[PDB]
Amino acid sequence: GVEIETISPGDGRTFPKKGQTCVVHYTGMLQNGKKFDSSRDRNKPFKFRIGKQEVIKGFEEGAAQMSLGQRAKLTCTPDVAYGATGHPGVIPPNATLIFDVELLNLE
Amino acid sequence: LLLQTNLINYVTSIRPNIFVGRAEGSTQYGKWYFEVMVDEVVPFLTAQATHLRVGWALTEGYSPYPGGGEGWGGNGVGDDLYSYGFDGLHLWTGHVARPVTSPGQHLLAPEDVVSCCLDLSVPSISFRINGCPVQGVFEAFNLDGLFFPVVSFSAGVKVRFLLGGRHGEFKFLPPPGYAPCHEAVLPRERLRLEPIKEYRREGPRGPHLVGPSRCLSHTDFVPCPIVLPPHLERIREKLAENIHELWALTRIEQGWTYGPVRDDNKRLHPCLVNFHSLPEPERNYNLQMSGETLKTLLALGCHVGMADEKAEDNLKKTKLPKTYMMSNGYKPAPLDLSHVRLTPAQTTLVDRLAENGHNVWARDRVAQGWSYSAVQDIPARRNPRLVPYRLLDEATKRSNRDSLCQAVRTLLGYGYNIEP
Amino acid sequence: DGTVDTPPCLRLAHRTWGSQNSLVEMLFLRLSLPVQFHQHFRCDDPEIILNTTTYYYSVRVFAGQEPSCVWVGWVTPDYHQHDMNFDLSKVRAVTVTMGDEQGNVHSSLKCSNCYMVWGGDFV
Amino acid sequence: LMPVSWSRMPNHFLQVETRRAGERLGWAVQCQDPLTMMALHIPEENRC
Numbered sequence: 256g257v258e259i260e261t262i263s264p265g266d267g268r269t270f271p272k273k274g275q276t277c278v279v280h281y282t283g284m285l286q287n288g289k290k291f292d293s294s295r296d297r298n299k300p301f302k303f304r305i306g307k308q309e310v311i312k313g314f315e316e317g318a319a320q321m322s323l324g325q326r327a328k329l330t331c332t333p334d335v336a337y338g339a340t341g342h343p344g345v346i347p348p349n350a351t352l353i354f355d356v357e358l359l360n361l362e
Numbered sequence: 363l364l365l366q367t368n369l370i371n372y373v374t375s376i377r378p379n380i381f382v383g384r385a386e387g388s389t390q391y392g393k394w395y396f397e398v399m400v401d402e403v404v405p406f407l408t409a410q411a412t413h414l415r416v417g418w419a420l421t422e423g424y425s426p427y428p429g430g431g432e433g434w435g436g437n438g439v440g441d442d443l444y445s446y447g448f449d450g451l452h453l454w455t456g457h458v459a460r461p462v463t464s465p466g467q468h469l470l471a472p473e474d475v476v477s478c479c480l481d482l483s484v485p486s487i488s489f490r491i492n493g494c495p496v497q498g499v500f501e502a503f504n505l506d507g508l509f510f511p512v513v514s515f516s517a518g519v520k521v522r523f524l525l526g527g528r529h530g531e532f533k534f535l536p537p538p539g540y541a542p543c544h545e546a547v548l549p550r551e552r553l554r555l556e557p558i559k560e561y562r563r564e565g566p567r568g569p570h571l572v573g574p575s576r577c578l579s580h581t582d583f584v585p586c587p588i589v590l591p592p593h594l595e596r597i598r599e600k601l602a603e604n605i606h607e608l609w610a611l612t613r614i615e616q617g618w619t620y621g622p623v624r625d626d627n628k629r630l631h632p633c634l635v636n637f638h639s640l641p642e643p644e645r646n647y648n649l650q651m652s653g654e655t656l657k658t659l660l661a662l663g664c665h666v667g668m669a670d671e672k673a674e675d676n677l678k679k680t681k682l683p684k685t686y687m688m689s690n691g692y693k694p695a696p697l698d699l700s701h702v703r704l705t706p707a708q709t710t711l712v713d714r715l716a717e718n719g720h721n722v723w724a725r726d727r728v729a730q731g732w733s734y735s736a737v738q739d740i741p742a743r744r745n746p747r748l749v750p751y752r753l754l755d756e757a758t759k760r761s762n763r764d765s766l767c768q769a770v771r772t773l774l775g776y777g778y779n780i781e782p
Numbered sequence: 783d784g785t786v787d788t789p790p791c792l793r794l795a796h797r798t799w800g801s802q803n804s805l806v807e808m809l810f811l812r813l814s815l816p817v818q819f820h821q822h823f824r825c826d827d828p829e830i831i832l833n834t835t836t837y838y839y840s841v842r843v844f845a846g847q848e849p850s851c852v853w854v855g856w857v858t859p860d861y862h863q864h865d866m867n868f869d870l871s872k873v874r875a876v877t878v879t880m881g882d883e884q885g886n887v888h889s890s891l892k893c894s895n896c897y898m899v900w901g902g903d904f905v
Numbered sequence: 906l907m908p909v910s911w912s913r914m915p916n917h918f919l920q921v922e923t924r925r926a927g928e929r930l931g932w933a934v935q936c937q938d939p940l941t942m943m944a945l946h947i948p949e950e951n952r953c
Contacts, residue, residue, distance in 0.1 A: 260461075262451065262468065262469060263468045263469060263471075264468075286821060288434070289366070290368070293409055295406065295409045296369075296409035351821075355411075363948070364948075365945050365946060365947065366945070366946040366948065367943060367944065367945065367946075368943070368944055369941050369942070369943060369944070370941065370942060370944050370953070371939060371940070371941055372919050372939070372940045372941065372942070374919060374921060376921070376923070376934060378932075402935070407939045408939050408941060410941075427912075428915065428918070428919075429912065429913065429914075429915045429942070430912075430942075430944065430952075430953050431952075431953065432859075432860055432951070432952050432953075433860070433951060433952070433953070434944070434946075434951075434953050435944060435953035442860055443860075443874040443876055443893060443894075443895055444874075446876070453878065455876060455878065455893060456860070456876070456893045456895075457860060458893070460878060460880070463880075463882070463883065465883070495883070497880055497881055497882065497883060498878060498879055498880045498881075499878070499879050500876060500877075500878055501876075501877050501878075501879070502875055502876060502877040502892065503874075503875070503876045504872075504873075504874060504875075506872075515934075515936075516939075517919060517936055517937075517938065517939035517940065518936060518937060518938075518939060519935070519936060520933065520934070520935035520936075521933070521934060521935075522926075522930060522931060522932070522933045522934075523931045523932040523933065523934075524931050525931055525932070528928065529925065529928060529931045529932065530929075530930065530931030530932075531929050531930070531931070555923045555932055555934065557921070562914070562918060564918075809906070810906040811906075812906075815949060816949060816950070859950045859951050859952065864906060864908055
């Protein structure tokens, strides 16, 4: 399982339900603070669908606690994202995934 | 194993002119407090998040160079052991984040006001956000140098300062015993803001290159300052009588006449007649203080003897003028010594003479637990003249120098020669 | 290189130690490759060697070198203290507390940059 | 450890601007335009 340490919430009334867009402007970070991914630089917000099992599930069920406009430094266990194989060439196995996400709109 | 590569933002910091330290002879207070409010901030002007931290930092060692730095760079407050800071949810010291448990916590929005505790008696620095306390302090640190508040801010941030009632306005009550920081300013310097260790300065003529600045030293606040010759006691009454003959007429031109009560607007002076026509301690105010200024005259190695005692009674005193007659009519004749004029060895000595008597008072005054401010606190025994002599301003430095000049220029005019 | 008895090592000496404008000061000598602990703690015999996680190094001061002015230990990369009247008092160390809002303190951890011992403490 | 060494002057410094807005508010300072720069790591000693 994951935990979520929030930064700055937004509306708090809305939460991601089934059949919805989910547009995030996230970045990434390995556990030593050595980042590898940031959708903010290429100016294109990541737009993944809910429940379709196309994102890694640590990003998925961790996004369930999010609200609209909420910014939250979450984290991920090794067992929820690339456990013993890793992404080949990019991240080694058995490594946590500290993130930094915020939701734009449309749940 | 390889050279990684990334973009990163620029950053800088600024401070006001407040430098509170601690020493053995400490003329200062030792516990301070200040507030800074935030009114305008954009989180994302670029791909990297904006950086905004507020805290305290040492003098000689907190050197943020703008290009690059340590860790990953963009170094501000907390990136080393020379600073301590806070940003909304993290304590920052030594380039490692320390989280908080704060009620209603978030990073600094607009209309958010911070407040920080600073203590030097006990080593302790803590913060209070929106009136609410935070769960941590800083202790066990070294004290080799003064302390100043800072704000380390990245691009696209507008922030405001609160110092004290002359300039700022406090939006929260200070804690018990914590003075507002606007009064720690030294009187020779008007308060301002500046960057820490500049080397490029903009200007008319297409920039400016400055060298290293000169900071106030750590023990620079500490102040610092026999037998009796036989004829010196014989001149101890003759000098103090002529000084009392000049003490009367100087206060007579300003208003103070012969009055046995003590007032300024009523202008009543007890020794406005003569030296023997004064009360016993008021005459001893001229007499018994002269043993102190003579026990240090040989302690400076100044060679002086009972020389030219022939014309001490032949060359007479000044003329008792018509305006020199006071409201009681009394006007003694001060022994003016205009025939003996200024010599540079004595003129350099009389600066070192007149500084030493005032500076040894400052230890004995502050031995009772006196502390410094820029204004007067009588029940808190704080005085705006509780600094060593070269730290004073030249107007007050002029006041306690010519008062000792006539004590010497008449004595050097008596033939008692001054040697360096 | 070391022998079969002595393990390999590296020393340092002083050429201009005698006359003709010698130079003697305080000099700060560290190694070139760091060590780093894991992300979380635990909370002769070949069996224990294949499982142990602790290492060892050593220095040897020399007879004729005064051990009252030697200091050994470990240092972080963020270290820029350069002076000539160094003592163990002159060590940057800051301890930070953290606890509950009702004064119930939880932990007080200390930051540093170096971790030194006085070499004169054994003579 | 050597005491001094060389470095490069960055070609553009950020625009800081200080003023005093009345005897009520106090001193203020602001900036608007961002500036960035590339970086190295040297990961065995962690200084950019």
